[PDB]
Amino acid sequence: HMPLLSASIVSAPVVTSETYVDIPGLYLDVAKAGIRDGKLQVILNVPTPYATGNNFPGIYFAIATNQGVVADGCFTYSSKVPESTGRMPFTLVATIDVGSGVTFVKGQWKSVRGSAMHIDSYASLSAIWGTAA
Amino acid sequence: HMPLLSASIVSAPVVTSETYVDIPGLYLDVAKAGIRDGKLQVILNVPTPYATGNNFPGIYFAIATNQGVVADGCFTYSSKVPESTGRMPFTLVATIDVGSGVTFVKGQWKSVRGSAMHIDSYASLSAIWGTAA
Amino acid sequence: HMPLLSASIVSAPVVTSETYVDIPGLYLDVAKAGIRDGKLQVILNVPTPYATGNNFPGIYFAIATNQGVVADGCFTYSSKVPESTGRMPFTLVATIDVGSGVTFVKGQWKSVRGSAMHIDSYASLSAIWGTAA
Ligand SMILES: C[C@@H]1O[C@H](C#Cc2ccc(C(C)(C)CN)cc2)[C@@H](O)[C@H](O)[C@@H]1O
Ligand SMILES: C[C@@H]1O[C@H](C#Cc2ccc(C(C)(C)CN)cc2)[C@@H](O)[C@H](O)[C@@H]1O
Ligand SMILES: C[C@@H]1O[C@H](C#Cc2ccc(C(C)(C)CN)cc2)[C@@H](O)[C@H](O)[C@@H]1O
Protein backbone atom coordinates (compact mmCIF):
# COMPACT_ATOMS: atom_id res chain seq x y z
CA HIS A 1 0.00 0.00 0.00
CA MET A 2 1.02 3.70 -0.26
CA PRO A 3 2.97 4.02 3.08
CA LEU A 4 2.00 7.81 3.40
CA LEU A 5 -1.46 8.71 4.82
CA SER A 6 -2.77 12.29 5.10
CA ALA A 7 -5.87 14.31 5.95
CA SER A 8 -5.96 18.11 5.95
CA ILE A 9 -8.51 20.88 6.64
CA VAL A 10 -8.73 24.67 6.06
CA SER A 11 -10.91 25.25 9.09
CA ALA A 12 -12.81 23.74 11.97
CA PRO A 13 -15.70 24.93 14.03
CA VAL A 14 -15.01 27.25 17.01
CA VAL A 15 -15.28 24.78 19.95
CA THR A 16 -15.39 25.14 23.77
CA SER A 17 -15.05 21.69 25.41
CA GLU A 18 -14.03 20.28 28.85
CA THR A 19 -13.41 16.84 27.17
CA TYR A 20 -11.41 15.71 24.12
CA VAL A 21 -13.57 16.05 20.98
CA ASP A 22 -12.78 15.17 17.34
CA ILE A 23 -11.40 17.90 15.07
CA PRO A 24 -13.62 17.23 12.04
CA GLY A 25 -11.58 16.15 9.00
CA LEU A 26 -8.44 15.15 10.89
CA TYR A 27 -9.07 11.43 10.64
CA LEU A 28 -7.10 8.59 8.98
CA ASP A 29 -9.01 5.34 8.33
CA VAL A 30 -6.18 2.73 8.78
CA ALA A 31 -8.49 -0.33 8.49
CA LYS A 32 -9.98 1.01 5.14
CA ALA A 33 -6.38 1.16 3.73
CA GLY A 34 -5.92 -2.57 4.58
CA ILE A 35 -3.24 -1.75 7.24
CA ARG A 36 -3.84 -4.36 10.02
CA ASP A 37 -0.30 -4.40 11.55
CA GLY A 38 3.13 -2.73 11.82
CA LYS A 39 3.72 0.84 13.12
CA LEU A 40 2.44 4.31 12.12
CA GLN A 41 4.50 7.47 12.82
CA VAL A 42 1.66 10.01 13.26
CA ILE A 43 2.10 13.79 13.11
CA LEU A 44 -0.68 16.17 14.14
CA ASN A 45 0.32 19.56 12.66
CA VAL A 46 -1.77 22.58 13.71
CA PRO A 47 0.53 25.40 12.58
CA THR A 48 -1.77 28.48 13.15
CA PRO A 49 -4.22 27.88 16.06
CA TYR A 50 -5.36 30.41 18.65
CA ALA A 51 -7.46 30.30 21.81
CA THR A 52 -9.61 33.05 23.28
CA GLY A 53 -10.57 33.26 26.93
CA ASN A 54 -10.43 35.04 30.28
CA ASN A 55 -7.86 32.81 32.16
CA PHE A 56 -4.46 32.12 30.45
CA PRO A 57 -6.07 30.59 27.36
CA GLY A 58 -4.81 27.59 25.41
CA ILE A 59 -5.72 24.33 23.66
CA TYR A 60 -4.96 20.69 24.54
CA PHE A 61 -4.42 18.59 21.38
CA ALA A 62 -4.34 14.77 21.22
CA ILE A 63 -3.67 11.93 18.80
CA ALA A 64 -6.35 9.28 19.48
CA THR A 65 -7.15 5.82 18.03
CA ASN A 66 -10.31 3.77 18.48
CA GLN A 67 -8.65 2.73 21.85
CA GLY A 68 -8.35 6.39 23.06
CA VAL A 69 -5.65 9.05 23.46
CA VAL A 70 -2.08 7.86 22.70
CA ALA A 71 -0.33 11.24 23.07
CA ASP A 72 -1.27 14.78 24.04
CA GLY A 73 0.09 18.27 24.73
CA CYS A 74 -0.88 21.91 24.79
CA PHE A 75 0.12 25.50 24.13
CA THR A 76 -0.88 28.26 26.62
CA TYR A 77 -0.40 32.05 26.59
CA SER A 78 1.81 33.70 29.27
CA SER A 79 -0.84 36.39 30.14
CA LYS A 80 -4.23 36.04 31.85
CA VAL A 81 -5.99 37.97 28.98
CA PRO A 82 -3.46 38.47 26.13
CA GLU A 83 -3.65 41.89 24.33
CA SER A 84 -4.18 39.90 21.10
CA THR A 85 -4.36 36.06 21.03
CA GLY A 86 -1.43 35.31 18.71
CA ARG A 87 -1.02 32.24 16.50
CA MET A 88 0.75 29.46 18.44
CA PRO A 89 2.10 26.70 16.14
CA PHE A 90 1.61 23.20 17.55
CA THR A 91 2.95 19.81 16.41
CA LEU A 92 2.54 16.40 18.10
CA VAL A 93 4.40 13.21 17.01
CA ALA A 94 3.62 9.64 18.23
CA THR A 95 4.37 6.16 16.92
CA ILE A 96 1.53 3.60 17.28
CA ASP A 97 1.56 -0.25 16.98
CA VAL A 98 -1.30 -1.07 14.50
CA GLY A 99 -1.27 -4.79 15.59
CA SER A 100 -2.64 -3.63 19.04
CA GLY A 101 -6.29 -3.18 17.65
CA VAL A 102 -5.98 0.23 15.79
CA THR A 103 -8.48 0.84 12.91
CA PHE A 104 -8.31 4.72 12.79
CA VAL A 105 -6.25 7.71 13.98
CA LYS A 106 -7.71 11.15 14.65
CA GLY A 107 -6.81 14.57 15.99
CA GLN A 108 -8.72 15.79 19.11
CA TRP A 109 -8.80 18.99 21.11
CA LYS A 110 -10.02 20.22 24.51
CA SER A 111 -10.20 23.68 26.09
CA VAL A 112 -7.64 25.05 28.53
CA ARG A 113 -9.55 26.96 31.30
CA GLY A 114 -12.74 27.30 29.23
CA SER A 115 -11.00 28.69 26.08
CA ALA A 116 -12.69 28.90 22.71
CA MET A 117 -10.48 26.86 20.35
CA HIS A 118 -9.75 28.20 16.81
CA ILE A 119 -8.47 26.52 13.64
CA ASP A 120 -9.28 28.83 10.69
CA SER A 121 -6.55 27.71 8.23
CA TYR A 122 -4.47 24.72 7.06
CA ALA A 123 -3.97 21.87 9.58
CA SER A 124 -3.00 18.21 8.91
CA LEU A 125 -2.87 14.69 10.32
CA SER A 126 -0.18 12.59 8.62
CA ALA A 127 1.10 9.04 9.01
CA ILE A 128 3.97 6.93 7.63
CA TRP A 129 3.44 3.11 7.70
CA GLY A 130 6.41 0.93 8.73
CA THR A 131 6.48 -2.93 8.94
CA ALA A 132 9.29 -5.23 10.34
CA ALA A 133 8.36 -7.75 7.58
CA HIS B 1 16.12 6.00 -4.75
CA MET B 2 16.91 7.14 -1.16
CA PRO B 3 13.29 7.86 0.06
CA LEU B 4 14.55 10.66 2.49
CA LEU B 5 15.23 14.16 1.06
CA SER B 6 16.62 17.07 3.12
CA ALA B 7 17.93 20.62 2.84
CA SER B 8 19.05 22.68 5.83
CA ILE B 9 20.45 26.19 6.48
CA VAL B 10 22.11 28.02 9.42
CA SER B 11 20.75 31.39 8.40
CA ALA B 12 18.80 33.40 5.89
CA PRO B 13 18.76 37.04 4.99
CA VAL B 14 16.60 39.43 7.07
CA VAL B 15 13.56 39.89 4.75
CA THR B 16 10.51 42.22 4.74
CA SER B 17 8.01 41.07 2.08
CA GLU B 18 4.25 41.53 1.35
CA THR B 19 4.39 38.39 -0.93
CA TYR B 20 5.69 34.84 -0.45
CA VAL B 21 9.43 34.73 -1.28
CA ASP B 22 11.86 31.76 -1.29
CA ILE B 23 13.89 31.07 1.86
CA PRO B 24 17.28 30.53 0.19
CA GLY B 25 18.57 26.98 0.72
CA LEU B 26 15.23 25.42 1.68
CA TYR B 27 14.69 23.74 -1.66
CA LEU B 28 14.35 20.05 -2.65
CA ASP B 29 14.86 19.22 -6.36
CA VAL B 30 12.42 16.25 -6.78
CA ALA B 31 12.88 15.98 -10.59
CA LYS B 32 16.76 15.84 -10.20
CA ALA B 33 16.30 12.81 -7.85
CA GLY B 34 14.31 11.00 -10.61
CA ILE B 35 11.07 11.12 -8.52
CA ARG B 36 8.28 11.64 -11.14
CA ASP B 37 5.34 10.14 -9.16
CA GLY B 38 3.98 8.93 -5.79
CA LYS B 39 3.63 11.13 -2.66
CA LEU B 40 6.05 13.26 -0.59
CA GLN B 41 5.40 13.97 3.13
CA VAL B 42 7.08 17.39 3.44
CA ILE B 43 8.07 19.02 6.73
CA LEU B 44 9.17 22.66 6.93
CA ASN B 45 10.91 22.99 10.33
CA VAL B 46 11.86 26.52 11.43
CA PRO B 47 12.54 25.90 15.13
CA THR B 48 14.00 29.33 16.18
CA PRO B 49 12.54 32.19 14.06
CA TYR B 50 11.62 35.68 15.25
CA ALA B 51 9.92 38.71 13.72
CA THR B 52 10.47 42.36 14.55
CA GLY B 53 7.92 45.09 13.92
CA ASN B 54 5.55 47.74 15.23
CA ASN B 55 2.15 45.92 14.86
CA PHE B 56 1.79 42.40 16.44
CA PRO B 57 4.70 40.96 14.44
CA GLY B 58 4.90 37.50 12.91
CA ILE B 59 5.86 35.42 9.86
CA TYR B 60 3.74 33.48 7.35
CA PHE B 61 5.54 30.30 6.19
CA ALA B 62 4.55 28.14 3.18
CA ILE B 63 5.46 24.90 1.46
CA ALA B 64 5.39 25.62 -2.30
CA THR B 65 6.01 23.53 -5.46
CA ASN B 66 6.52 24.75 -9.01
CA GLN B 67 2.63 24.95 -9.06
CA GLY B 68 2.51 27.34 -6.03
CA VAL B 69 1.67 27.19 -2.31
CA VAL B 70 0.30 23.83 -1.09
CA ALA B 71 0.14 24.67 2.63
CA ASP B 72 0.76 27.68 4.86
CA GLY B 73 0.54 29.01 8.41
CA CYS B 74 1.97 31.60 10.74
CA PHE B 75 3.08 32.48 14.26
CA THR B 76 2.25 35.94 15.71
CA TYR B 77 3.12 37.62 19.03
CA SER B 78 0.30 38.50 21.51
CA SER B 79 1.58 42.12 22.03
CA LYS B 80 1.63 45.08 19.63
CA VAL B 81 5.40 45.69 20.30
CA PRO B 82 6.75 42.76 22.38
CA GLU B 83 9.32 43.71 25.12
CA SER B 84 11.71 41.25 23.41
CA THR B 85 10.76 39.30 20.22
CA GLY B 86 11.12 35.74 21.52
CA ARG B 87 11.91 32.65 19.44
CA MET B 88 8.68 31.07 18.15
CA PRO B 89 9.19 27.49 16.88
CA PHE B 90 7.24 26.72 13.70
CA THR B 91 6.62 23.44 11.86
CA LEU B 92 4.42 22.83 8.78
CA VAL B 93 3.56 19.33 7.41
CA ALA B 94 1.89 18.62 4.00
CA THR B 95 1.65 15.58 1.75
CA ILE B 96 1.95 16.28 -2.01
CA ASP B 97 1.10 14.07 -5.06
CA VAL B 98 4.28 14.15 -7.27
CA GLY B 99 2.29 12.76 -10.30
CA SER B 100 0.38 16.14 -10.39
CA GLY B 101 3.37 18.00 -12.13
CA VAL B 102 5.75 18.60 -9.10
CA THR B 103 9.50 18.99 -9.93
CA PHE B 104 10.62 20.86 -6.71
CA VAL B 105 9.50 21.74 -3.16
CA LYS B 106 10.61 24.88 -1.32
CA GLY B 107 10.03 26.82 1.88
CA GLN B 108 8.66 30.40 1.52
CA TRP B 109 7.93 33.23 3.91
CA LYS B 110 5.99 36.52 3.96
CA SER B 111 5.74 39.32 6.53
CA VAL B 112 2.88 39.70 9.00
CA ARG B 113 2.00 43.46 9.22
CA GLY B 114 5.32 44.60 7.72
CA SER B 115 7.54 42.49 10.06
CA ALA B 116 11.21 41.88 9.42
CA MET B 117 11.58 38.07 9.26
CA HIS B 118 14.58 36.39 10.98
CA ILE B 119 16.16 32.94 10.59
CA ASP B 120 19.67 33.08 12.14
CA SER B 121 20.14 29.38 13.02
CA TYR B 122 19.30 25.81 11.94
CA ALA B 123 16.15 25.34 9.80
CA SER B 124 15.22 22.41 7.49
CA LEU B 125 12.97 21.23 4.67
CA SER B 126 12.55 17.45 4.69
CA ALA B 127 10.62 14.94 2.59
CA ILE B 128 9.84 11.21 2.70
CA TRP B 129 8.95 9.58 -0.68
CA GLY B 130 6.08 7.04 -0.71
CA THR B 131 4.77 5.07 -3.77
CA ALA B 132 1.64 2.78 -4.03
CA ALA B 133 3.67 0.56 -6.43
CA HIS C 1 14.27 -3.94 9.96
CA MET C 2 11.22 -1.91 11.12
CA PRO C 3 12.10 1.50 9.46
CA LEU C 4 10.27 3.47 12.31
CA LEU C 5 12.14 4.10 15.61
CA SER C 6 10.59 5.85 18.64
CA ALA C 7 11.22 6.72 22.28
CA SER C 8 8.77 8.70 24.41
CA ILE C 9 8.57 9.99 28.01
CA VAL C 10 5.85 11.47 30.29
CA SER C 11 8.29 13.58 32.23
CA ALA C 12 11.88 14.55 32.83
CA PRO C 13 13.68 16.01 35.78
CA VAL C 14 13.62 19.81 36.28
CA VAL C 15 17.12 20.79 34.98
CA THR C 16 19.21 24.01 35.03
CA SER C 17 22.28 23.59 32.77
CA GLU C 18 24.77 25.89 30.95
CA THR C 19 25.74 22.90 28.66
CA TYR C 20 23.72 20.44 26.56
CA VAL C 21 22.63 17.48 28.75
CA ASP C 22 20.67 14.33 27.83
CA ILE C 23 16.88 14.35 28.29
CA PRO C 24 16.55 10.94 29.98
CA GLY C 25 14.49 8.51 27.88
CA LEU C 26 14.81 10.39 24.58
CA TYR C 27 17.38 8.04 23.11
CA LEU C 28 17.33 5.78 20.02
CA ASP C 29 19.96 3.00 19.89
CA VAL C 30 20.61 2.78 16.08
CA ALA C 31 23.51 0.28 16.37
CA LYS C 32 21.34 -2.12 18.55
CA ALA C 33 18.72 -2.15 15.70
CA GLY C 34 21.45 -3.30 13.24
CA ILE C 35 21.24 0.01 11.28
CA ARG C 36 24.89 0.70 10.19
CA ASP C 37 24.17 2.90 7.12
CA GLY C 38 21.64 4.97 5.13
CA LYS C 39 19.81 8.07 6.49
CA LEU C 40 17.54 8.73 9.51
CA GLN C 41 14.94 11.55 9.46
CA VAL C 42 14.86 12.43 13.18
CA ILE C 43 12.11 14.43 14.88
CA LEU C 44 12.46 15.73 18.43
CA ASN C 45 8.89 16.62 19.52
CA VAL C 46 8.52 18.46 22.85
CA PRO C 47 4.94 19.69 22.53
CA THR C 48 4.34 21.13 26.09
CA PRO C 49 7.61 22.44 27.63
CA TYR C 50 8.03 25.53 29.81
CA ALA C 51 10.96 27.41 31.31
CA THR C 52 11.05 29.43 34.51
CA GLY C 53 13.54 32.19 35.21
CA ASN C 54 14.30 35.85 35.85
CA ASN C 55 15.68 36.91 32.38
CA PHE C 56 13.53 36.14 29.25
CA PRO C 57 13.44 32.40 29.96
CA GLY C 58 13.64 29.61 27.40
CA ILE C 59 15.16 26.23 26.49
CA TYR C 60 17.71 25.22 23.84
CA PHE C 61 16.94 21.74 22.43
CA ALA C 62 19.30 19.62 20.30
CA ILE C 63 19.41 16.37 18.35
CA ALA C 64 22.80 14.76 19.12
CA THR C 65 24.56 11.54 18.00
CA ASN C 66 27.64 9.92 19.51
CA GLN C 67 29.56 12.54 17.34
CA GLY C 68 27.75 15.53 19.00
CA VAL C 69 24.98 18.02 18.16
CA VAL C 70 23.64 17.80 14.57
CA ALA C 71 20.84 20.37 14.92
CA ASP C 72 19.54 22.75 17.57
CA GLY C 73 17.04 25.53 18.28
CA CYS C 74 15.16 27.23 21.06
CA PHE C 75 11.95 28.88 22.21
CA THR C 76 12.10 32.04 24.40
CA TYR C 77 9.38 34.16 26.06
CA SER C 78 8.87 37.80 24.93
CA SER C 79 8.87 39.17 28.56
CA LYS C 80 11.69 39.39 31.11
CA VAL C 81 9.54 37.62 33.80
CA PRO C 82 6.34 36.31 32.13
CA GLU C 83 3.12 36.63 34.26
CA SER C 84 2.74 32.84 33.82
CA THR C 85 5.30 30.70 31.89
CA GLY C 86 3.03 29.28 29.17
CA ARG C 87 3.53 26.01 27.29
CA MET C 88 5.67 26.59 24.18
CA PRO C 89 5.48 23.67 21.70
CA PHE C 90 8.83 22.82 20.12
CA THR C 91 9.74 20.49 17.23
CA LEU C 92 13.17 19.93 15.62
CA VAL C 93 13.73 17.91 12.39
CA ALA C 94 17.16 16.77 11.04
CA THR C 95 18.30 14.10 8.60
CA ILE C 96 21.51 12.23 9.57
CA ASP C 97 23.84 9.97 7.48
CA VAL C 98 24.22 6.73 9.57
CA GLY C 99 27.29 5.65 7.47
CA SER C 100 29.23 8.64 9.04
CA GLY C 101 29.81 6.72 12.42
CA VAL C 102 26.33 7.13 14.13
CA THR C 103 25.38 4.44 16.73
CA PHE C 104 22.70 6.43 18.69
CA VAL C 105 20.49 9.56 18.51
CA LYS C 106 19.33 11.50 21.57
CA GLY C 107 17.47 14.63 22.59
CA GLN C 108 19.42 17.22 24.65
CA TRP C 109 18.56 20.49 26.33
CA LYS C 110 20.36 23.52 27.82
CA SER C 111 19.12 26.56 29.75
CA VAL C 112 18.49 29.97 28.20
CA ARG C 113 19.78 32.65 30.67
CA GLY C 114 19.81 30.27 33.65
CA SER C 115 16.21 28.98 33.14
CA ALA C 116 14.86 25.91 34.88
CA MET C 117 13.75 23.57 32.06
CA HIS C 118 10.43 21.65 32.40
CA ILE C 119 9.04 18.58 30.61
CA ASP C 120 6.15 17.21 32.72
CA SER C 121 4.14 15.43 29.98
CA TYR C 122 4.42 13.50 26.68
CA ALA C 123 7.56 14.16 24.57
CA SER C 124 9.09 11.96 21.81
CA LEU C 125 12.17 11.27 19.70
CA SER C 126 11.28 9.56 16.41
CA ALA C 127 13.23 8.36 13.39
CA ILE C 128 12.44 6.96 9.93
CA TRP C 129 15.23 4.84 8.30
CA GLY C 130 15.88 5.36 4.56
CA THR C 131 18.49 3.51 2.39
CA ALA C 132 19.52 4.21 -1.29
CA ALA C 133 19.95 0.41 -1.72
C1 LIG D 1 -6.53 36.15 16.08
C2 LIG D 1 -5.59 36.95 15.21
O1 LIG D 1 -5.50 36.25 13.96
C3 LIG D 1 -4.71 36.94 12.97
C4 LIG D 1 -4.63 36.13 11.75
C5 LIG D 1 -4.49 35.47 10.78
C6 LIG D 1 -4.18 34.65 9.66
C7 LIG D 1 -4.13 33.26 9.83
C8 LIG D 1 -3.76 32.44 8.81
C9 LIG D 1 -3.41 32.95 7.54
C10 LIG D 1 -3.00 31.97 6.42
C11 LIG D 1 -2.19 32.68 5.33
C12 LIG D 1 -2.16 30.80 6.94
C13 LIG D 1 -4.30 31.34 5.86
N1 LIG D 1 -4.96 32.33 5.02
C14 LIG D 1 -3.48 34.35 7.37
C15 LIG D 1 -3.85 35.19 8.42
C16 LIG D 1 -3.28 37.19 13.48
O2 LIG D 1 -2.54 38.00 12.59
C17 LIG D 1 -3.32 37.82 14.84
O3 LIG D 1 -1.99 37.91 15.36
C18 LIG D 1 -4.21 37.08 15.81
O4 LIG D 1 -3.74 35.77 16.10
C1 LIG E 1 15.95 38.08 19.31
C2 LIG E 1 16.46 37.42 20.56
O1 LIG E 1 17.26 36.31 20.13
C3 LIG E 1 17.92 35.62 21.22
C4 LIG E 1 18.68 34.48 20.69
C5 LIG E 1 19.24 33.51 20.31
C6 LIG E 1 19.80 32.27 19.91
C7 LIG E 1 19.24 31.60 18.81
C8 LIG E 1 19.69 30.36 18.44
C9 LIG E 1 20.73 29.72 19.13
C10 LIG E 1 21.21 28.32 18.66
C11 LIG E 1 21.94 27.58 19.78
C12 LIG E 1 20.05 27.44 18.19
C13 LIG E 1 22.10 28.53 17.42
N1 LIG E 1 23.39 29.04 17.86
C14 LIG E 1 21.30 30.41 20.23
C15 LIG E 1 20.84 31.67 20.61
C16 LIG E 1 16.89 35.10 22.24
O2 LIG E 1 17.53 34.56 23.38
C17 LIG E 1 15.96 36.20 22.64
O3 LIG E 1 14.93 35.66 23.47
C18 LIG E 1 15.35 36.91 21.45
O4 LIG E 1 14.52 36.06 20.66
C1 LIG F 1 3.30 26.17 34.06
C2 LIG F 1 1.82 26.17 33.76
O1 LIG F 1 1.49 24.83 33.37
C3 LIG F 1 0.08 24.62 33.15
C4 LIG F 1 -0.15 23.24 32.72
C5 LIG F 1 -0.38 22.15 32.30
C6 LIG F 1 -0.65 20.91 31.67
C7 LIG F 1 0.33 20.33 30.87
C8 LIG F 1 0.09 19.18 30.17
C9 LIG F 1 -1.16 18.53 30.23
C10 LIG F 1 -1.38 17.23 29.43
C11 LIG F 1 -2.87 16.97 29.20
C12 LIG F 1 -0.70 17.27 28.05
C13 LIG F 1 -0.70 16.09 30.20
N1 LIG F 1 -1.53 15.75 31.35
C14 LIG F 1 -2.15 19.12 31.06
C15 LIG F 1 -1.90 20.30 31.76
C16 LIG F 1 -0.44 25.57 32.06
O2 LIG F 1 -1.85 25.49 31.93
C17 LIG F 1 -0.03 26.97 32.35
O3 LIG F 1 -0.40 27.82 31.25
C18 LIG F 1 1.45 27.11 32.64
O4 LIG F 1 2.26 26.78 31.51
Residue numbers in the entry:
A (entry chain AAA), B (entry chain AAA), C (entry chain AAA): -1 to 131
Give the published text.
We solved two new crystal structures featuring complexes of BC2L-C-Nt with synthetic ligands 22a and 8c, allowing further rationalization of the affinity observed. The structures resulted from soaking BC2L-C-Nt crystals for 24 h in a 1.25 mM solution of each ligand and were solved to 1.79 and 1.32 Å resolution by molecular replacement. In the structure featuring ligand 22a, the alkyne linker is 4.1 Å long and does not significantly dislocate the nearby crystallographic water W2 (top). The fragment’s aromatic moiety engages in the predicted π/π T-shaped interaction with Tyr58, with an edge-to-face distance of 3.9 Å between its centroid and the closest C-atom of Tyr58 side chain, albeit the angle is 58°, rather than 90° (top). Instead of the salt bridge predicted by docking, a water-mediated contact between Asp70 and the amino group is observed (top). Other characteristics of this interaction include the shape complementarity of hydrophobic patches: both methyl groups of the fragment are in close proximity with the otherwise exposed hydrophobic surface generated by the main chain of Gly71 and side chain of Tyr58. This hydrophobic complementarity carries on to match with residues Cys72, Thr46, and Ser119. Alternatively, 22a with a KD of 281 μM was identified as the main hit with suitable values in both SPR and ITC and a nearly 10-fold affinity increase from αMeFuc. Additionally, we can rationalize the affinity gain observed for hit structure 22a as the result of three factors: (1) the T-shaped π/π interaction, (2) the shape complementarity between hydrophobic surfaces, and (3) the thermodynamically advantageous entropic factor.
